[PDB]
Amino acid sequence: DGAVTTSQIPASEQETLVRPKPLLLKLLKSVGAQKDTYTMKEVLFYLGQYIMTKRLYDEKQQHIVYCSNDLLGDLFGVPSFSVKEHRKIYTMIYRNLVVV
């Protein structure tokens, strides 16, 4: 368990409670998550752990994640994305859960 936060998104939005649909829930459980209801910053921590463990960000100054051949690309619906465009990342995650 853990959290990952950003100044690009209001802090209160990062505390939003969400119930992942089945694919997102599986990715979280694969790196140690134990429940069905999370905050958005917990979802970003587990997704970061998932990105590390699956070796999807080994070049630490590149700023782009390539995911077209991973579960992540199916989840988000894109082949790659910038790690710096935080609002766009939140939009993609919201499509994969029910907000409480």
Name the nearest CA neighbour of 18 among 82, 100, 94: 100
What is the pattern of x (binds ligand 2U5, CB under 6 A) and - over residues 68-87? ---------------xx-x-
Residue 40 in contact with ligand 2U5, rule: CB under 6 A = no
Place of tokens 């209001």: 10
Residue 33 in contact with ligand 2U5, rule: CB under 6 A = no
Residue 28 in contact with ligand 2U5, rule: CB under 6 A = no
Name the DSSP letter for residue 66. Answer: E
What span, in angstroms and rounded, lies between the C-alpha atoms of 10 and 1?
A: 22
Q: Which is nearer to ligand 2U5, 48 or 73 (CB)?
A: 48
